[PDB]
C-alpha cells in the first residue's frame, strides 16, 4: 500500500520511556533536549500519515519512522523530544539532528552519514564527544567544553566546532572532507589528513600533523608541532 500525505500538519505527542540513544533515518526534522521532565515525543507531521508513525523505546534506544504503508510523500515531518542523556546518535537519511538544549554527560558518540546533518546548539559538557561523518554527512557544534574530541571524515563531508576547549584531541580525515575547528583550543591535538581534505584546527600546547597526499593541515598556535609529509600536501600555521 502506498500513501500521500494530506498537506495539512496536525500534532500529536505521547509519553516514552526514558532513552540514552537515538537512531533517525530519513527526511526528519528531529529537535532533542536534554532534561529530566518526562520523556516525550511529540510529532508534526501530515495529518493523515499519524496512524502510520511508529515510535518505539526498545532497551533504552528511540527509532521514529514509518509502519504499515509506503509513505510516497509527506510535507514534513517534525519530531520534538527529551532524555536525562544522550549517549549515542545514528543519523542517516536526509535528517537533520538538532540538539536544542545544553548537553551534559560522560560520552557522547554521534555517526551520521548519507546527507544527514547534525547541529549541536548549546555547550557540550562532556568527558569525551566522538563525531564519526561519513557519505555526505556535515556537522555543526556551536560550543564544546570536554576532556576528549575525536573527529573522523571519511567522506565528503564537514565537521565545524565553533569554540570551546579539549584537553585533548584527536581528528582524522580519510575522504575529501574538511574540518573546521579553529576555534576549538585543544592543549594535545594530532590530525592525521590522507584525503585531500583539509583541517583547520588550534593547538595550544603540541601538534602531531600527518599528511599523506594532497591534503592540507592549517594550525593557529602557540604549539611545538612534530610534522610528517608524504607526498605534496602541506601543514602550516595560520595567523
Given at each position: 500500500?502506498?500513501?500521500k500525505?494530506?498537506g ?11 532513552y ?18 518526562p ?13 502510520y508513525?511508529?515510535i ?25 523530544t ?6 549515542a ?9 538538532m ?9 557522547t ?12 546548539k ?13 557519505g ?12 576528549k ?8 563531508g ?7 576547549n579539549?584537553k585533548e ?71
Open positions: 500500500d502506498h500513501v500525505g494530506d495539512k500538519l496536525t500534532s500529536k505527542k505521547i509519553s516514552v520511556a526514558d540514552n540513544e537515538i537512531k533517525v533515518d530519513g527526511v526528519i526534522d528531529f529537535n532533542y533536549e536534554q532534561s529530566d521532565d520523556s516525550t515525543v511529540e510529532v508534526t507531521v501530515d495529518q493523515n500519515l499519524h496512524p508513525v511508529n518505539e523505546v526498545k532497551d533504552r534506544v528511540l527509532t521514529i519512522a514509518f509502519k504499515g504503508a509506503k509513505v510516497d510523500h509527506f510535507t514534513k515531518f517534525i519530531v520534538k527529551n532524555s536525562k542523556w544522550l549517549a546518535a545514528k543519523v542517516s537519511g536526509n535528517a537533520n539532528f540538539v536544542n538544549s545544553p548537553l551534559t554527560g560522560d560520552e558518540v554521534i555517526k551520521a552519514n548519507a546527507n544527514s546533518l547534525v547541529q549541536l548549546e555547550t557540550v559538557t562532556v568527558g569525551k564527544l566522538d563525531l564519526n561523518v561519513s555526505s554527512a556535515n556537522m555543526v557544534v556551536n560550543h564544546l567544553e570536554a576532556d574530541i575525536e573527529c573522523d571524515i571519511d567522506g565528503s564537514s565537521i565545524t566546532i565553533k569554540k570551546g579539549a584531541g584527536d581528528y582524522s580525515i580519510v575522504s575529501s572532507g574538511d574540518i573546521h575547528a579553529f576555534g576549538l583550543a585543544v592543549p594535545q591535538l594530532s590530525c592525521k589528513v590522507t584525503g585531500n581534505g583539509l583541517a583547520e584546527v588550534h593547538a595550544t600546547d603540541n601538534l602531531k600533523a600527518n599528511v599523506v597526499g594532497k591534503g592540507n593541515i592549517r594550525y593557529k598556535g602557540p604549539t611545538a608541532v612534530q610534522q610528517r609529509i608524504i607526498g605534496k600536501g602541506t601543514v602550516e600555521e595560520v595567523k
